[PDB]
Write a protein that binds this ligand. Structure first.
Ligand SMILES: CCCCCCSC[C@H](NC(=O)CC[C@H]([NH3+])C(=O)O)C(=O)NCC(=O)O
Ligand SMILES: CCCCCCSC[C@H](NC(=O)CC[C@H]([NH3+])C(=O)O)C(=O)NCC(=O)O
Ligand SMILES: CCCCCCSC[C@H](NC(=O)CC[C@H]([NH3+])C(=O)O)C(=O)NCC(=O)O
Ligand SMILES: [Ca+2]
Lengths: 241, 241
């Protein structure tokens, strides 16, 4: 009964996480785009004082999203929102019930956030060498069940946390978007197509095939165009060596 | 009933996080120290392929910790362990039951891990400027309930996650541990004693007063000595800006 509003942006893989989870929960919710990196509305700090997307309001009176209510709960940080949606919709089984399988899901989320995300950031925003990123991706791939399935076996919020980033990698590379050089762009594209990374390719296909991805994805070319609006992706710019 | 073994090290605030939660859970468990930074045992990758402390084994036959069983579940990443202990011991109420209050706990953990922890790392190990760390700490302080209490009201695993790091700050500063300059040491000691940080001081006192802290802390002087065994805290080195 309590309303959910997700403040979103098409380029934001963090917001994408939460859209995927809300779809998997079968939740009723509103999305509201915010041009957070170029033209933040003056009211936005009322829903998130950190001034980041995603932001979520929960409950309170129904109001237009650009007139947030002080009575709604203000929830920040995408992974906290993922666990929140699992808590709100237990019958949707967005986590396993078995403690050890739940821990696989939490561990996978931590592996991505602690060791992989920053490597994506270094390569895409600074143009540092790709090898440490490929190494981190091989580590993450190693945590998947080798014979198939999602991070914790059945689909869980762990896969909502990770697919937005992995799914952007291939189309961004194909467009040459990011501060890495052509040489590293080619090296990454080759690596990600090689048998070294067959398992994570299967993982990306399996996550993308679910309705929760299809219904929250603009299309590869459309996502690339939204990403080009990101100031620190510096479209047209590349660092070398 | 299944066995819990936590591979530990006194200097590791990440391991401290999990000892606190296990104490709060009233769990039966074994700890085993690992000299992970100076002399990793050859068997240690069997309990954590990432080669980090903490590591946890769960279940399997009862064996000496230096003879780990292939049959035990291997759990990595301290925050995943915190959630696992909450899942294993629901009657200990290591999280709230209310979804919004649970979200406060998850958000607080994310705020620390995403915005504060890296500033502690960069100030202590690289000697980067202290002001961004103090800014991040003011942000974290602002997430606390203003009138007292823990991150989500009642004590929760969010407080296990954060106190190891905040509790080390004061004695480390007083002992001059870290690669930051003299000027930034003075600045941080003055700030952390100023009215600006009264709320987080009460928070640290409130967390330290619980038996779960007292029974897992070696003492301030002892923790300082353990931290001096960390190789990248190179004695006699300071960075300046
Ligand atoms: C490949 C494109 C990546 C684009 C940047 C990431 S999406 C927008 C970005 N959001 C975040 O940084 C949120 C991270 C936060 N830790 C979470 O998990 O929700 C933001 O609002 N940033 C504004 C700010 O940090 O001030
Ligand atoms: C193919 C996928 C490419 C993924 C690129 C990385 S985007 C995520 C990146 N986030 C971080 O680096 C972590 C920031 C911070 N520690 C947090 O947890 O919010 C970011 O928002 N960075 C914003 C910036 O660096 O400008
Ligand atoms: C107060 C002293 C300063 C802190 C020292 C770091 S603690 C030991 C360190 N552990 C980690 O980095 C664990 C991080 C992991 N993300 C977690 O949450 O468990 C380790 O084993 N490192 C070995 C490695 O990374 O290879
Ligand atoms: Ca506040």
């Amino acid at each position: 009964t309590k309303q959910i509003t997700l403040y979103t942006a098409t380029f934001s893989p963090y917001a994408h996480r939460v859209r995927i989870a809300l779809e998997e929960a079968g939740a009723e919710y509103t999305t509201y785009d915010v041009d957070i990196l170029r033209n933040m509305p003056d009211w936005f700090p009322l829903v998130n004082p950190l001034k980041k997307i995603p932001a979520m309001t929960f409950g309170g009176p129904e109001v237009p999203p650009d007139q947030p209510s002080p009575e709604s709960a203000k929830i920040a940080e995408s992974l906290a929102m993922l666990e929140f949606i699992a808590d709100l919709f237990p019958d949707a089984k967005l986590l396993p019930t078995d403690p050890v399988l739940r821990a696989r899901a939490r561990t996978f989320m931590a592996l991505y956030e602690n060791y992989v995300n920053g490597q994506f950031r270094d390569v895409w925003f600074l143009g540092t060498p790709a090898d440490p990123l490929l190494q981190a991706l091989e580590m993450l791939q190693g945590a998947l069940p080798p014979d198939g399935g999602f991070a914790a076996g059945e689909w869980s919020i762990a896969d909502a946390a990770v697919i937005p980033f992995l799914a952007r990698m291939f189309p961004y590379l194909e467009a040459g978007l990011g501060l890495y050089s052509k040489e590293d762009g080619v090296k990454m594209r080759k690596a990600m197509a090689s048998e070294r990374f067959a398992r994570i390719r299967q993982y990306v296909r399996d996550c993308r095939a679910r309705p929760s991805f299809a219904n929250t994805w603009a299309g590869d070319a459309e996502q690339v165009e939204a990403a080009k609006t990101v100031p620190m992706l510096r479209v047209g710019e590349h660092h070398h060596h």
